[PDB]
Structure 1
Amino acid sequence: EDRLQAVVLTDSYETRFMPLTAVKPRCLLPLANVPLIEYTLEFLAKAGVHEVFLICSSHANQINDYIENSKWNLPWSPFKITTIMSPEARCTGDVMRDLDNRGIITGDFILVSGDVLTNIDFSKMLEFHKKMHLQDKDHISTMCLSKASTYPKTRTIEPAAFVLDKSTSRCIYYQDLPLPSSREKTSIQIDPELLDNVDEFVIRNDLIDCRIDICTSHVPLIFQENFDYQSLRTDFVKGVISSDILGKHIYAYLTDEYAVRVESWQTYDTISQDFLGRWCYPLVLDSNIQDDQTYSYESRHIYKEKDVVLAQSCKIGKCTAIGSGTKIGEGTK
């Protein structure tokens, strides 16, 4: 209930953004004139948390000075902020077990892997997780995800296919769907021995991955001695449900609206325009919170700050965003 712990980890997609990222992390990159550290931080400020735990396996010196220039080292933030330095190529999960060997984390706590952006409430996620507590003592976690309804196959890097229960929404199995432009590897496999006590169960694709899971502190200790797991869902959510451990129930969660996580520039292409449009209701841009901005809204999605020198005869089309210190010229578009 109380003492909402969390764990924030960047630095897993340095492979993805290699022409960039040589001087600054992926999480430091500006989505709409401002980076995406604080997109998560204000979202777990909405969660009502008490402490965070950063992971900086690379570029560690230029993280905390930005936090020193943030509002988060100043004592009215929802959480005190802590960092953990690390050397390079320290993958997910092995960041957990060494932290589990430290063992600060107590009770329930928040996994945020990648870098996320959403509009989902913290409320209805959590009593649903407590409904799993009141329905199971051998529970694991509840994985909240959205529903990319009209678009399959444009979740760019990896397509993720999920099978889960009708009633309890217990995730039955995970198998990674191949590349959809590759018409060759056309087979999935789900072993029906573990399909005993469900008998009506839903197998989906469009649950767009955002890695936003919260769980108790027992399941990293379960994850501890199973040291041969290296990912979050590529290996561990399979092996915890593929009959090897006996009687362990992980749930997922589906929402009817926006939650997303950056994978490539193509994800950075889409959700930047979705955030610039009103698809990120209510978390909108003219709130102006982070570097306490001066954006004023105009119709057809115009995001202008002050000190904006707009020249004559330059048409500004739909879905644009302009900061200060800027000067457009004549005849531009």
Structure 2
Amino acid sequence: MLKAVILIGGPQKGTRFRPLSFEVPKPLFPVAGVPMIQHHIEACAQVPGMQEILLIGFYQPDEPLTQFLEAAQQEFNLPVRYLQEFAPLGTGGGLYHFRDQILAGSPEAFFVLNADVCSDFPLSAMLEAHRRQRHPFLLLGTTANRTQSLNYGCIVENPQTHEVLHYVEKPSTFISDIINCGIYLFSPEALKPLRDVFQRNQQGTIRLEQDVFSALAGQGQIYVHLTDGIWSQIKSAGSALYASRLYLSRYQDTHPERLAKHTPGGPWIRGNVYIHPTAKVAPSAVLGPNVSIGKGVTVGEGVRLRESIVLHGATLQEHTCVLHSIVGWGSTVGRWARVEGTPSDPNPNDPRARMDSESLFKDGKLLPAITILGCRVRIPAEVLILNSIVLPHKELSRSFTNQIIL
């Protein structure tokens, strides 16, 4: 038997995902219709031998997290527990702090997944490689562009034994095309270096990449497993859109009943579109590629929706165009209003993609990105929101362009 540890963050790691995170926690943001960690729990309960799923984070258990945990426990036939760490303990410090609960029942190995990644999660093939080799650390790696790889944790390996010889968390200079994916397979022996790291701290917070992956690289403990299935990070509020698009593309294999079909008496559907059943979509509303509709969403007639997330309880009145946007919970977009953004994906194989920095401005100018509307934002009739971020509970009366509307 095995178990999974999904490292969800806490409220400080959700600061970068801020317009969206004001209402829900970041790991519960619905990416292609289901919350962000439900893709992880989906992929982990698909593995034969999964006993437990242990979320580690420093979120307080509010109503949405505990209701999600009970819903995941019923839907996925597993005990899904939430281990709240007493302090922000870094990446590996919460795995070392909870080692008695992780190793309870003596699992053969355990997965360690970052909650902010979108992946196909090739957990079975990682397990095949681990049961072949039996090493302390198995990392998942992807190939990136040489220019984009500097935004990520670079891995220099040995292409015959697949041993990580070098690891650097964000190098200024080129190191390697292999980037860490935030998916790991630890054996129980892997909790013995972390102990050492913690003991060296006494002369509690352990960063897994800077203190364990970069230290034991080349000593025989850390190994790679490569893929090139889908992979994305979700850091800012608008990388949720790229993650949603990748997931809606892989629903063509894993859940094709989530994807909506045209059915000539209904709304006109291009590309991959998720529509929740509670949503009412008018038959003249064409829903373009990579759209996901939340529950309780009333989409009026003639509404064009392309490359967007419309969250729960939102309302798009007649003849609206919503492109590359995230319409928040309960937001209302009046008739002939245009909410337009600019596509900006992380995409580590795109040589023109931005670094996904925390600074949204270059020199006073807001860089063109996804248009985020917070919850309860009333966009008036006949008005354009272009490349803007609107903070929650803001009733607007005016056209806004390249602005953060506080």
TM over 0.5: yes
Matches within 5 A, 1:1-333: 3-11=1-9, 13-48=13-48, 49-62=50-63, 63-68=65-70, 70-73=71-74, 77-100=76-99, 104-105=103-104, 106=106, 107-133=108-134, 139-148=135-144, 151-154=145-148, 158-178=151-171, 185-186=172-173, 204-207=176-179, 209-227=180-198, 228=201, 230-241=206-217, 247-276=219-248, 278-279=249-250, 281-284=252-255, 286-288=256-258, 296-298=260-262, 299-306=270-277, 307-310=279-282, 312=284, 314-325=285-296, 326-329=298-301, 330-333=318-321
Structure 1 consecutive aligned stretches of length 4 or more whose deviation exceeds 6 Å: none
Task: State the distance in 2 between where 1:226 and 1:96 align.
Answer: 12
Q: 1:240 to 1:53 in 2, by over 3 A?
A: same
Q: What percentage of residue pairs aligned between the two structures are identical?
A: 22
CA RMSD, Structure 1 to Structure 2 (Å): 2.9
* Runs of 5+ consecutive residues of structure 2 not aligned to the other structure: 263-269, 302-317, 322-406
Task: State the distance in 1 between where 2:196 and 2:128 align.
Answer: 30
Q: Which one scores higher on RCO, CA 8 angstroms, separation ≥ 6?
A: 1
CA contact (8 A) 2:28 2:35 kept: yes
Q: TM-score normalised to the size of structure 2?
A: 0.62
Q: Which amino acid aligns with 1:171?
A: V
Q: TM-score normalised to the size of structure 1?
A: 0.74
Three-state SS of the structure 1 residue aligned to 2:167 is: strand
CA contact (8 A) 2:55 2:81 kept: yes
Task: State the distance in 1 between where 2:244 and 2:194 align.
Answer: 35
Name the structure where strand makes up a greater proportion of residues.
Answer: 2
Task: State the distance in 2 between where 1:21 and 1:317 align.
Answer: 26
Three-state SS of the structure 2 residue aligned to 1:162 is: strand
CA contact (8 A) 1:160 1:176 kept: yes
Q: Which amino acid aligns with 1:168?
A: T
Q: Which amino acid aligns with 2:99?
A: D
Shift of 1:153: 4.3
CA contact (8 A) 2:230 2:246 kept: no
Shift of 1:169: 1.0
Three-state SS of the structure 2 residue aligned to 1:163 is: strand
Shift of 1:170: 0.5
Task: State the distance in 1 between where 2:4 and 2:38 align.
Answer: 15
Shift of 1:240: 1.4
Q: Which amino acid aligns with 1:26?
A: K
Three-state SS of the structure 2 residue aligned to 1:126 is: helix
* Runs of 5+ consecutive residues of structure 1 not aligned to the other structure: 134-138, 179-184, 189-202, 289-294
Three-state SS of the structure 1 residue aligned to 2:97 is: helix
Shift of 1:23: 4.6
Three-state SS of the structure 2 residue aligned to 1:226 is: helix
Q: 1:42 to 1:15 in 2, by over 3 A?
A: same
